DNA sequence: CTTCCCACCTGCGCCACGCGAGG
DNA sequence: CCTCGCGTGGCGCAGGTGGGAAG
DNA sequence: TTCTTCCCACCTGCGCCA
DNA sequence: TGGCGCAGGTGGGAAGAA
DNA sequence: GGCGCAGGTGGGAAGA
DNA sequence: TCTTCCCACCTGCGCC
DNA sequence: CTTCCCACCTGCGCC
DNA sequence: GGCGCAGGTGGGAAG
């Protein structure tokens, strides 16, 4: 008959004692007045047997929480009915609801825990609370005094495939970076490398109070990834031989022409930095030194910090600036391929690549080529790029198989290079503005521009997924689908 | 004489429902090895006795010799699902004139339109010709019953007609080969694990025309039926012709814009078939029949690939030849039956 | 059948057909599949407390993304209060690990004519879950094979969101439930054979009984289907039909269902055996006769003494005979059928030999193939397959590991743990020590490890020794030595055979 | 046909690190065959010249012969990890008496307490004896360097000392046999896929003493090495003996209760050894050299099964004999080694 | 005469649904 | 006419018992 | 308004082997 | 000699074009 | 200011 | 002899 | 004072 | 006589 009234009174007396469950910690009122009452017959379709009215310190505050009492006679099936009844109370226009349930059941040991889990993981609402009570003592005037305990309170743009660079994300770079990471994880107490006396002097002159090694590697951190990057940079790319700015033979300064320890993709020789062309950071400095415009100390400072544009050109960059560009495009490539974790530790696939390279000839070997190509296709999501371009090309060439062709010598249509470039531009516009699966920013108004899909098409051509002939009259880009099929079941 | 290196499937015989019902019959009769016999009607046995004395009517009308498990499954499939007692009625004598009964088999058409017809689909069919001969008075009821199972020889040059025995032989020898090549039945005739998987899919998701059954059949054709090998052959021999010359079969009809026509399509298909059957020795081809019409080069493979989505419906392009859809072919290769 | 469980299957079939017709009911506009295939199925028996009326299984063009939509059918009989309960159990099924949950409520109620609109308004404003679909149905016509065809509309669609392992509602036995005489190998073989024969070409007409049996069923159960009463079935599922065709064809055959014999004017027992072989293989099993206190013998004795007539005997043959204080109430055909079906189907489902909907799986078909090829369920190959399945799919290997670990832990601290003095000073391992050791093992497994389930005791002279069926099966299959106990170890497991049967790749 | 039916291991030679570093050296040398030969000391080359007039200074300190990939990796491992330049110094005090340097190699020990160590650590060691006779003037510094490679004669009761060459031969044969029987290297010496898996887990999870390396070693000992067959044999024979009498070999105790004493354990193990040797013809046995001490029956096998967890630490019990733990054995028996 | 095993017998817990008393 | 209160269908799975058979 | 042309569901019957 | 395993024909709908 | 990834330019090679 | 085209080596740009 | 284990030692047969 | 593979022995820990 009249049993939920005692539970409602107990909850009302508890709410004032513990404002934390009724109100959030951000705006918890100092004083709250709580009373118990029964809903009017016109309140709504649900009966709303009892409700506790709570008010904050202010005069205009007013909230009502309709509570639901489920006796153990209902069983474990009353838990589900209680959840539904709480939702109806909120829909009727109440501020909140309370599910008062026994602490334990004959078959269910943790009813309140289950109800709270249901309300959290699925309902996603914070306006209904759960109160599990100990068995009451009918003799006492207030059987639920101290029996009710709270359980759950209530509250009253992206490229979409792996970023790779033509000259900075070679196979040997990945191999040696992973090897250095593994060796440094094996021996965390490895000693920091050393820099030349002239190099550290120039670094100090350029920037006072800066770490010579943290400066030449373009890092501001001490994490594991920073450490392995520093070791790789100062051991494989920026070797002591490479870091020699000039040669002082016979009184005339000439670039030493020293190469690094990272093999080129073609395998003809090793890679180079700051040397090899008519203009290079290690050759303009030598030319200036022979001319006499700068001193040897100024030469070291220019080598570390670069050379300004001097008008109408790209300002040449030194070791510090090139370090950031090299670092942030081999880190991002490995992260996107998921060959390293977030902390910077090689994964199972990174260890598999290292194992393939060590067991077989090297990074420039057939097994390593196959593994890297399959990783690019599957994990690098180059298959998505191939599917996109194939779909767009087919939908453009089905309407007209001579879409971009030009008249030939005798009038026979021919797929010239201008047609290829405008077709690629249309593909780029479709992939950027319409499909929105490529982040792209314009700028750099320069005498020369760069080919659309330069690195992607270069890598695809090198790995064999597209034909050596870069275009055809009908298909457009001649995708080799047998190779893609073979690479799509490698199961790395 | 090399054998064709993919599954032999026809267009109206080796459908998705025929396989399902044949496998169901085999599965049901595996648990009931002592199934007595199927039944005929007295006129049929009288006609069979008149034609071939001292021969079993059941094994004569089903065109079978032994009594093995697979022969038993065919006997219970022919006379119960295809040559049903309704189908085996040759005419409908109403108001003194005869006509085609209009009976359909119990096998679906593989497109959901209706059930498949047998021997009376259109004019000049077996039942229609028999009814016309009966109306004309050329033959009697006994001769009509004999012709319904023996067939009518060609009146002129033309082509002969097929009775129940010959059609049963063709259907049986083109369905058992297809089921054996897909590895859906064992050598003895018992269904394999993949046959049971197909059974379960069809019985659970609503028949052989459901999406799940279509996906399973397409994956089986690509992987077990070696249709992916055929697609690879076609694609590798096609890209070798449009790379040397992207205008191989232009047929310059319009004055300035060549267009890929149907004659060019048939020339390209003939070149592909010649390369497949002579240079590669993969296909098997037989001397043709001097007839007003001929079947196309790849009549059934091309339509099977077109229906399952592995080849575009337009079946035409100036530079690509046969447009294959490699997104669906790759997806169908990871089903792991 | 049950007026509620009969309509749930029809509603599930109609909802599956509707989802097939319009793939956008359960999917989104952006990710709309080309087409999907949907079927109706039921929750497995051993899966969680919250039990739904059924689930629609959806398979899209990926051929691997199989989903499940736990249904909740409601009837006008349970007033208007059932809407809140339906919402509650819908959230419960969502917590159970289901992608969707579809309320199947009626569209017309006495209070207000807009139940579905209210349900959506409650769901879309407070619940905030897009995986709860709402259907409103019209009064079906229960006189056609498709009563719900065209009378259900999807008022609110759903958007899809596993790991239903815990089911924290008390301890549950972790190995497969097997029995000594009811749940046997040949019963499994014949049940699977019936299921496979009924799946192909379904809708077999019916089983039939005798005129006297039908008259007795009507006399002691008016207005009930004789087949459903004599089989203790209240549904139209595929597995229910398989059980109906298996009970009245293999076990309760017409020869078996003959209660008495009127030779020389004195009632007797026909001496008729079933068609199911025994695990021994000596002779076919028996039902309701073969002992002094059996049901058929008791009925014949009552008839001979004149206590009851033929009509009362026929009624007692199917309704059983009560006990006048001393003894246990005798069991008729109906209750024994219930017991047999629930021992066999639970074991078949736990062994993963029949799917959730009822069709046999690949392992069930493999068992049928072995039995039919090698000459029955008592062949050596069938025995090996059954033992390996019991070890692997049934958690009998886990049971052996548990008991071995507990026994080793007990006997490492103190050998001669339970022994008693023998002829001289040499201790012996007598039967009392064996029973005490088994009781201690059971107490450890139940109270502490929470692996087994124990209910109560019947307070009868016999006691149902601790590991009765499990140890019997292990001894018969060879994983436990024939000598039941040993002084040093306790239960002498043979680990060579356990590891031989642990890797057969079935 | 006497031939032991399990992998041949030893307590201190075929350790986890002695395999990890050996395989690492093999992998490193396979990727660069053109590598400089290891460099010895100066007088160490002279002493060999005194010992042998034509032997190579590296092919003599390693007992190697001819030339092969296996010989090269063995020499590199021996001179880089075991016979390190620091270890190869016999006396390093030179103050008022020549003491023992206490040099430890780079090979960790199984218990992980400290690095391994040869020819030092106990009174009856090679270096301590040489230092003793060099402080007393019994030999010369050149004679001491010669004896450090040749080995002192008996000069005592029954046995001789071993130098560096003979110890190198013993270590080489032990490691080579334990690696070839485990199928961790090919016949030519190249590591297999299992060896590379071992190297990967050792390098990735913190050396050969980590939990992953221990688990892999136990798994490959149970599966690839026929230790499971040995465990099955001993368990079957123990159960066969104890079924007849569950109180076999026991002796009266304090209150008359039977007890499994050490003598009972030794005679039970001896009976097991006799059954495995002269009855099943599984083991291979030889003479005992007639020495005051004797190695126990199953010394290396039981030690490995005990420290890897397949046999309880308490080496015996009353009614079972050897308390084999079958949960761990079963768990390790299903592992892709 | 007593106790164990195995093929037979036997029904306890508990959820979910339905009908009805009280308000 | 809503809400529980109580009954029960059905379901799943766990608990007895007679006769051979050894001791 | 009528003549072709391709395509599937519905028809034939080589061609080798015992 | 016939059975076995595949291969090679036609007839009406839809279309496109004159 | 550091970090994600975009955007250039020499110089063989291959021809007009 | 002059024009492009690709690759390997080289440059900064929007954004907490 | 005695015994056992496990790192460090030591030769045994046989082609 | 070199290889594949068996056999001892000191010092700590526990009784
Ligand atoms: Ca209430
Ligand atoms: Ca319901």
Author numbering:
A (entry chain A): 6 to 161, 175 to 510
B (entry chain B), D (entry chain C): 174 to 510
C (entry chain D): 2 to 162, 166 to 510
Paper quotes:
Type IIS restriction endonucleases (the topic of this study) combine independently folded target recognition (‘TRD’) and endonuclease (‘EN’) domains within a single protein chain, cleaving DNA at one or both sides of their target site. Here, we report biochemical analyses and high-resolution crystallographic and CryoEM structures (in the presence and absence of bound DNA) of the Type IIS REase PaqCI. It forms a tetramer in solution in both the absence and presence of bound DNA, recognizes a longer target than FokI (5′-CACCTGC-3′), and cleaves each strand of bound DNA much closer to the bound target site (4 and 8 bases downstream, respectively). The enzyme displays a similar tetrameric organization of target recognition domains in the absence or presence of bound substrate, with a significant repositioning of endonuclease domains in a trapped DNA-bound complex that is poised to deliver the first of a series of double-strand breaks.
A 50 bp double-stranded DNA construct containing the enzyme's target site and sufficient downstream duplex to extend past the enzyme's cleavage site was used to generate a DNA-bound enzyme complex in the presence of calcium (which facilitates the formation of a productive cleavage complex but inhibits cleavage). A CryoEM density map of the DNA-bound enzyme, corresponding to approximately 3.0–3.6 Å resolution, was generated from 1,291 micrographs and over 800 000 particles. All four TRDs within the PaqCI tetramer are individually engaged with four corresponding double-stranded DNA duplexes through contacts with the enzyme's target site sequence to form a complex to cleave a single DNA duplex. The binding of DNA imparts minimal rearrangement of the TRD tetrameric assembly. In the DNA-bound complex, all four endonuclease domains (ENs) have dissociated from their original positions, where they were originally sequestered against their corresponding target recognition domains (TRDs). Two of the ENs, extending from one of the two enzyme dimers in the protein tetramer, have reformed a catalytic EN dimer around the cleavage site of one of the bound DNA duplexes (indicated by boxes in all panels of Figure 4 and in Figure 6). The other EN domain (colored green) is engaged with the opposing strand of the same cleavage site in trans (i.e. that domain extends across the dimer interface from a TRD bound to a different DNA duplex and target site). The cis-acting EN domain is positioned appropriately for cleavage of the phosphodiester located 4 bp from the target site, while the trans-acting EN domain (which has moved a much longer distance to re-establish contact with its partner) is positioned appropriately to cleave the phosphodiester bond 8 bp from the target site on the opposing strand. The opposing two EN domains (also previously packed against their own TRDs in the DNA-free apo-enzyme), which are also released from their TRDs as a result of DNA binding, are unobservable and appear to be disordered.
